[PDB]
């Protein structure tokens with residue numbers, strides 16, 4: 001019932017009770033753990049809504065109040081009547097901040113309470129959506145001094161009128177498969193980069209072509225839009241010692257903004273809720289630049305450093321890795337763009353975890369994702385036992401639209 | 408039921424049916440994952456079924472399932488159990504069981520070597536002195552002058568639980584840790600508690616930074632006894648760097664033989680409480696964890712100062728730069744002195760191949776991602792991108808409580 005988590009570096013033991021409010025399933029069972037797997041009705045609605053309001057009113061110290069009882073009845077009626085309901089703005093904001101609060105895979109949750117919420121529920125078209133998105137991008141970028149934000153489009157009705165942003169992030173580079181068999185640009189986006197062309201986009205076939213937004217409103221077909229170049233802040237990547245680094249011609253955008261997830265609040269579903277914070281260095285330096293299925297630049301950087309790539313035991317890949325990461329952080333800091341290094345980010349998460357354990361009774365956390373992709377054990381999260389479970393409100397994965405859309 | 412795992416770097420998908428033979432629990436439920444938690448006398452009633460499953464697995468492995476030799480063995484064990492309440496394994500079954508406990512160890516990245524385990528049968532052992540002799544022979548055989556060979560030595564199994572054989576050391580070879588009155592620690596902080604127990608038992612500690620601890624051996628449930636491993640049998644490696652001539656001046660060295668000695672080996676229901684085993688080191692175990700954990704030798708600062716790195720802000724990644732160099736140093740030293748060792752790229756690449764082979768020939772390969780992925784450079788090794796399934800199969804190696812916590816001293 002009452003589980004404990006120990007930190008093996010400091011011996012600190014914390015007790016977790018919050019998991020007892022868990023509702024969804026983990027993917028695991030008493031016989032098999034799937035901890036490393038990436039993707040493991042009016043009757044159904046009212047209980048969900050009730051759970052939500054109860055936690056909302058409890059949070060505002062008005063649990064079991066008339067206000068609580070009243071709103072509770074109002075939604076009940078509305079659901080029985082409209083088969084659904086609408087959240088007050090206060091509930092919308094609270095639900096959003098909490099879905100972030102509950103994202104077990106996010107290392108930056110110490111910032112959860114400061115989220116700026118943009119209510120875009122009154123949106124009706126793709127141009128509208130485009131307008132809302134440009135505004136989000138500009139507000140969030142804030143000339144390099146990034147601020148967390150989320151823009152929430154209209155909730156689901158009959159699934160046949162869902163709003164969706166086809167991009168996986170508001171800002172991502174294109175990927176083209178060249179005759180060479182090789183891939184130009186970002187391999188992760190190759191497919192999408194084609195679905196844009198299949199819609200009309202005039203790809204510039206470069207190594208870093210900011211993709212175009214493909215916005216879908218009320219279930220209609222998606223439309224393209226080219227984010228104002230002046231609103232997309234990019235950082236040229238240069239090393240603070242290796243002048244040849246700049247010749248690699250690498251650059252990355254300053255705004256990470258997941259746009260393909262689904263936000264669930266009180267049973268209600270929001271299929272279009274792009275959100276953004278700021279990068280942790282490693283996301284770019286390790287994964288985007290060094291994953292083999294991505295820009296895979298380790299060999300190139302290795303060569304330029306004149307390292308002995310003959311034997312893996314020379315740890316050349318590891319040395320190159322560190323440098324590629326030193327340059328990203330350096331480049332971002334120099335241009336005054338917000339970015340956090342894995343040491344600082346993990347330290348803050350540990351601090352956040354401790355606050356959460358004593359003020360909320362726990363903090364769902366996915367160790368496989370919280371531990372940085374480099375120098376794992378030299379960060380404090382490596383030594384921290386964590387409990388993973390699903391709390392609502394939450395951010396969930398959802399099928400790509402192009403594999404579900406009835407044109 | 409079938410379970411698929413995918414490699415997100417190569418898009419390869421594998422199917423797992425082996426998990427169906429999994430009996431033991433994981434610590435997880437449909438409502439919570441405990442994947443990152445370190446630690447989440449039998450009765451005749453529960454023994455024969457356990458013996459039976461094992462024998463069935465054993466006879467299928469040798470292509471004689473259902474044979475007369477198979478049925479006669481089951482009858483013999485059954486009679487023996489009701490007759491004596493327990494049973495003895497044949498040499499063949501012991502060897503098979505030991506190899507399979509390793510093969511089933513989900514936290515081990517070196518399993519590609521599993522079938523090559525040299526098994527030493529020490530079931531005829533009766534005294535601590537005898538235990539010391541078997542262990543010296545194990546160390547010498549396994550070390551092989553630097554060309555390491557996997558080995559395990561198996562002491563008498565548990566009977567009533569009051570006559571256990573235990574090796575109190577957590578590893579046959581380890582450096583002493585000493586708590587100073589000023590609160591600082593000399594040596595390996597990880598071994599301070601055990602070191603105190605040794606001194607209390609009469610060990611004369613030399614109090615240096617790398618003193619090989621003595622063996623504290625418990626036979627037949629009696630009080631443990633101290634023995635010093637002949638120095639000439641302990642292979643050690645001075646750590647130096649291939650380009651930084653000042654590295655050697657750090658005064659670092661490490662033993663060459665890693666030998667877990669505090670785990671319990673379970674085979675067909677039988678419990679072997681003293682079963683020291685050894686293979687060889689993956690570099691990061693020494694370079695990353697033993698040297699750089701804040702709770703161990705903690706040398707990152709000193710190494711960073713010497714390299715004269717910008718330690719003014721973590722964002723310069725000085726800790727990361729120093730870590731890589733320390734790890735290059737460990738691999739270079741071992742290779743130079745011709746002592747077996749493997750780097751994390753090589754070990755993880757071998758594990759992936761081993762894993763695929765297992766899915767294809769065995770129907771699966773229980774693996775703990777949290778432990779398999781190296782403590783540095785995670786995503787540039789193939790295992791980071793590999794989905795894994797973790798479950799418990801027997802025979803197996805299990806944790807057991809430290810003996811000083813449960814021992815009834817006789818004095």
Ligand code: HEM
Nearest residue numbers: 100103105106107108111148150275276277278279280395
């Ligand atoms: C303020 C700075 C923030 C930092 C430094 C941060 C950092 C991170 C990191 C490093 C990851 C892993 C990314 C990956 O490997 O793909 C992550 C994942 C995630 N974060 Fe945060 N984050 C921040 C803001 C946000 C915000 C504002 C939200 C939502 C409102 C959020 C929701 C999540 C979710 C749901 C995931 C997992 C997504 C997935 O499964 O792909 N994060 N974050």
Ligand code: HEM
Nearest residue numbers: 509512514515516517520557558684685686687688689804
């Ligand atoms: C041939 C060399 C081998 C290599 C390179 C190898 C590598 C490793 C490494 C790196 C770990 C993680 C250790 C840690 O982080 O504390 C591990 C764990 C483990 N290995 Fe192996 N191993 C080898 C041989 C063996 C043998 C011979 C056995 C058993 C017969 C074995 C049983 C285990 C067990 C049970 C664990 C987990 C121990 C624990 O939970 O503390 N390994 N191995």
Ligand SMILES: N=C(NCCC[C@H](N)C(=O)N[C@H]1CN[C@H](C(N)=O)C1)N[N+](=O)[O-]
Nearest residue numbers: 169256257258275276277278279280283
């Ligand atoms: N720092 C982030 N990071 C999350 C988005 C960027 C991340 N580096 C990324 O590329 N995410 C993709 C690829 N892997 C995720 C998946 N589940 O497949 C989505 N978000 N934020 O709001 O501050």
Ligand SMILES: N=C(NCCC[C@H](N)C(=O)N[C@H]1CN[C@H](C(N)=O)C1)N[N+](=O)[O-]
Nearest residue numbers: 517665666667684685686687688689692
């Ligand atoms: N390569 C190894 N490694 C395992 C032993 C060395 C390991 N670095 C170690 O010190 N293990 C201790 C500390 N942590 C484990 C635990 N569960 O607490 C035991 N063994 N082998 O047989 O080849």
Ligand SMILES: C[C@H](O)[C@H](O)[C@H]1CNc2nc(N)[nH]c(=O)c2N1
Nearest residue numbers: 036037038368369791792793794
């Ligand atoms: C297979 C494995 O689950 C996969 O590679 C995971 C591991 N941990 C991760 N952690 C983070 N933060 N992001 C990722 O994309 C992943 N990928």
Ligand SMILES: C[C@H](O)[C@H](O)[C@H]1CNc2nc(N)[nH]c(=O)c2N1
Nearest residue numbers: 382383384385443444445777778
């Ligand atoms: C808390 C967490 O489980 C713990 O620090 C684990 C993580 N992964 C590990 N992996 C290996 N190989 N060895 C360890 O000691 C650990 N420690």
Ligand SMILES: [Zn+2]
Nearest residue numbers: 028033435440
């Ligand atoms: Zn699990």
